[PDB]
Ligand binder design. Structure first.
Ligand SMILES: [Mn+2]
Ligand SMILES: [Mn+2]
Ligand SMILES: [Mn+2]
Ligand SMILES: [Mn+2]
Lengths: 631, 615
């Protein structure tokens, strides 16, 4: 069974020989991607725990695995605890892991490319606070040579101790201006302006965030499954006396085509290889810098990997968001229009999927289908659509009790038969037009009063956030609250955020803005956000209703600008799940307004392609967009 | 009191000394400052509380908060001084707006304004040298002045007194012990703490004083010296002639050494400072501490942060809450007497011979009748008609208006041994227009929502500010102030540690005491504000979550004449009746037990305004 006990007892033989007392493994890559590829998944190889979130502490004792609360169920069914100790990290338990390591040994090791500076600094500060009489020495270990080292040794490893897959040779391609509305040259010019005015204390900026590099250069790639990104670093050297000294692009050159180097060399970009980043920083750059108002040597993203961080002296590094974060959080008008087209396509795909579900429901063949079968079906209907690339994340297809698991990951052994019950579908896709994220909840059986109540309580928060009018200064955490409001009155909550930013053909989860309880800021026009309240009833069912929307200016008076949202997502809601004792007439009016707009948008497109859809499809569309009676 | 004369006279004293910056503030950063600290008004004849005066060779520039703009416009002469306004988005304009040797009042300037100004001017003029000027000797050379360039006026000899445990529920020793633990665990990088906030010192020592009009505070400093594991020395700087016999008993009981007030700077420079990657700080100072004390230390060694006392007093213990309920019971009775009085004169038309100030005096009187009353907690706002549209409206001798059959707004409160009250009610002495009724009800809807709102404990207080605005937002209307502020116990009516507002925000904790006061102000016509005080309670605890809500402190009804029933939900009607009935159940037995202070006419009036709405 790819024996865990074996690979673990094997692991401590490699540690002992290098005189390493405690090893720390984390699920991460060097670019801090949410979804990491196979080469970077070490923890699963040892523990047979495939959950995305995890941190493994490996000592002479039984190893400890830390996972987020949302992954607790998955870890319980996967990990066997006679080998590993399972600990859970909750909202109040977060720094436990930092305490835990402190409470145990003289030499600790880290994967240099798999460890963020945030986790490193907090652990190290914990140890200063834990053992003040001990001094810490930090060394980078190159090519597995440990022979160069009272004291606590922090070892940052170039090569990982766990060695590991398929490789991507597919070529990079240009994202056309018609889709992104802004050329790579203007964006670089914008980054240039930022260095003149906004950040004056650094001449050197390193972009390690893959969606930032792709966005700035208008390039996409195949190095990741769910995002059209590519392994890269992009280094800017600014000369105050007022432009860029050097622009260096680290990436995989064999994946660089002819006419990409045309756009690249036009902007005066020097191309190096991907693995050249560390030696280039260590050898050419850091020695080239000269030694009241402080001036920093380098500006790094907050989550930059440990290996690149440790090349410098901490006093000279500035950890902050790249200017690209703000740049890309606000879409231009071409970008919004393109995001509308993508959602039109995605509405058609959902229409085909639920039409398909409805037919098989009537024929009852639907209940021989599985979660994976339905997951594959919606992904298929998207692939038929124009300018589609691939799904924007792993589709969540959950029937009955599985819908109560937010992070539910359908395995080959977890796959469930579709039942006449609640069905939750969270899915999206990557288009040249943009990135989509949408959730709909439906019912293939006869909905209970509880199910309709929960759905409607969730819907009310969702509908509120759709049309909410708020002064421009309003903190986005206030918008998170009104989505929870109706659940709060019933003493119910959901354990995730209400909305996340979404990139344009980049990442389905994008920073720069959000709607959530912890942290928040005013929203700006043409920010693109999800709206997805939910509620999850353990062992019974779960509900989530998700749209994407963008911020508009609603009205401007003498003293104040009022903002609101406009819809991106076009698909109707589930009438079978509606509780009308909870619904106001205004909400019903907004429901009818939305559904009518959907019919007006989708129906002509359905009709012009009778071979692709047909009368049964358009008839289904008409019925679910039909106005609800007010009386 | 010629401004031009005093301005050109001001220019005789600076020129000999080779931009002067005047601010309305005192050394303890109090909202309300005494006569000794108002310099700007002497030059500009601008009596507004908030202001900063930039004095250069050109025409001087005065910066005031937006709420003081109306007052500043008719008072200030604008051909002499340039008037600029500070709103929510122009906050740093003045620093941009802000030359060679520049001067500041050392005791009237906070380090926040000082450091932000210096960092900004550096940000492009890449070098600055800073010197302290003692006793007006400038010949040794940013200039920080010990003595101001701009003081005959009165002094308080009234005695300090002890705040009994029965009111505050915790002894001074217990609070110090809490402050002690804080230094053990929470703050390990500094051994020295200086309390410059008068309400923090008053709270900790359970002492009150007469040095301020609207708050029972006293000029003081309190310095703590921590030794790795207790306080080595605790020194209390204050005015000893105002220190009575048995207060110095409570002081020496806590092993506090009493020095005088003016010894603060000499004791710091001479006695303490000559002592003492992972950094250790010499001193911890409150963010708004004056420059004079700040410049005794090097910036690198100065840790600027909220004292632990801020968190301590922002959360009331149960005795403190119970006392504050008693305070509001008394203040409900006072309001009852006042509006009953207004109603009587309304029927006879005698009300419209009354003025705003006369009504202001009347409500303050009815408070003075109540047990354990000390004085008003702030200047009572009494505004009729168009004046109600002014948020900051200060009734003057020349602004005093005859009471009219129109909107009337009353914002008032008092200091009790039991606590500090703040309450606003808006009523109508005429026949309310549909517009007036609509605006009142839109404000009320936000107010009522904030009363009973259920929120998970992590909810940012800015979310609560929003739901108070939302019904106004839908009509594209807003109010230019915050929704709520913290309130001290027999302390400042505006207290930090928490708030409900659009900009800053944090989760709320149980037994925090906050105002709830949405409003709307229609220029030149009328204005409405509805204010309660309430405290945070635990509503429900589930497996995964704690839900919080508020419980009422303020007991007084709302105005039925101003209700727009097209805007009111049945839930809102139900809550109104629940509140009004509760008020009757609370107040009526007390009204009945004192017929000579509260007549039969009063009991009937109370019953009428607490009567259920037909829904
Ligand atoms: Mn989704
Ligand atoms: Mn989403
Ligand atoms: Mn107030
Ligand atoms: Mn008030």
């Amino acid at each position: 069974d790819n024996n865990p006990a074996a690979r673990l007892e094997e692991l401590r033989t490699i540690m002992k020989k290098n005189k390493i007392d405690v090893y720390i493994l984390i699920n991460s890559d060097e670019h801090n991607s949410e979804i990491i590829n196979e080469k970077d998944k070490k923890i699963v190889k040892i523990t047979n725990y495939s959950g995305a979130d995890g941190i493994l502490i490996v000592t002479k004792d039984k190893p400890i695995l830390y996972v987020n609360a949302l992954y607790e169920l998955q870890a319980m069914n996967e990990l066997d605890q006679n080998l590993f100790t399972l600990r859970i990290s909750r909202i109040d338990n977060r720094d436990e892991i930092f305490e835990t390591i402190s409470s145990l040994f003289n030499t600790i090791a880290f994967d240099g490319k798999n460890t963020s500076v945030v986790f490193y600094e907090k652990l190290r500060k914990a140890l200063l606070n834990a053992y003040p009489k001990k001094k810490i020495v930090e060394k980078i270990i190159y090519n597995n040579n440990f022979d160069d080292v009272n004291v606590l040794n922090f070892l940052v490893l170039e090569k990982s101790l766990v060695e590991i897959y398929p490789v991507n040779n597919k070529t990079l391609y240009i994202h056309d201006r018609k889709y992104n509305g802004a050329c790579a040259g203007e964006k670089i010019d914008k980054l240039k302006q930022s260095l003149m005015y906004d950040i004056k204390n650094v001449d050197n900026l390193l972009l390690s965030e893959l969606d930032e590099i792709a966005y700035l250069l208008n390039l996409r790639g195949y190095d990741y499954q769910y995002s059209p990104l590519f392994y890269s670093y992009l280094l800017f050297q600014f000369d105050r006396e007022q432009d860029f000294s050097k622009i260096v692009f680290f990436t995989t050159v064999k994946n660089l085509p002819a006419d990409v180097k045309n756009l690249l060399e036009i902007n005066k970009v020097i191309v190096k290889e991907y693995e050249e980043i560390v030696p280039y920083l260590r050898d050419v750059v850091i020695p080239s810098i000269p030694k009241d108002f402080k001036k920093y040597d380098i500006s790094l993203s907050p989550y930059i990997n440990l290996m690149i961080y440790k090349l410098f002296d901490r006093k000279n590094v500035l950890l902050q968001n790249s200017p690209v974060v703000k740049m890309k959080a606000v879409k231009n008008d071409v970008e919004i229009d393109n995001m509308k087209q993508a959602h039109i396509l995605d509405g058609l795909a959902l229409l085909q999927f639920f039409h398909w579900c409805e037919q098989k429901r009537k024929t009852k063949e639907l209940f021989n289908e599985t979660e994976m079968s339905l997951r594959h079906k919606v992904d298929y209907f998207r692939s038929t659509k124009k300018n589609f690339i691939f799904p924007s994340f792993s589709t969540i297809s959950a029937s009955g009790p599985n819908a109560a698991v937010i992070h539910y990951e359908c395995t080959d052994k977890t796959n469930a038969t579709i039942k006449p019950a609640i069905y939750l579908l969270d899915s999206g896709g990557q288009y040249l037009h943009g990135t989509t994220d949408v959730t709909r909840t439906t019912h293939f059986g006869e909905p209970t009063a509880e199910e309709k109540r929960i759905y409607t309580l969730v819907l009310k928060g969702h509908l509120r956030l759709r049309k909410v009018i708020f002064a421009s200064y309003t903190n986005s955490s206030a918008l998170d609250f009104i989505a929870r409001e109706n659940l709060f009155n019933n003493f119910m909550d959901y354990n995730h955020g209400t909305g996340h930013g979404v990139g344009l053909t980049l990442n389905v989860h994008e920073g720069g803005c959000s709607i959530g309880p912890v942290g928040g800021a005013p929203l700006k026009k043409n920010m693109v956000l999800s709206n997805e309240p939910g509620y999850y009833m353990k062992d019974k069912f779960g509900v989530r209703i998700e749209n994407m929307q963008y911020v508009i200016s609603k009205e401007i008076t003498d003293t104040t600008e009022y903002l609101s949202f406009d819809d991106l997502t076009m698909y109707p809601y589930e009438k079978k799940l509606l509780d009308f004792s909870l619904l106001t007439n205004q909400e019903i009016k907004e429901l009818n307004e939305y559904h009518t707009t959907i019919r007006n948008t989708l129906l002509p497109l359905v009709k012009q392609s009778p071979q692709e859809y047909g009368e049964s499809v358009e008839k289904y569309l008409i019925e679910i967009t039909e106005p609800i009676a007010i009386h």
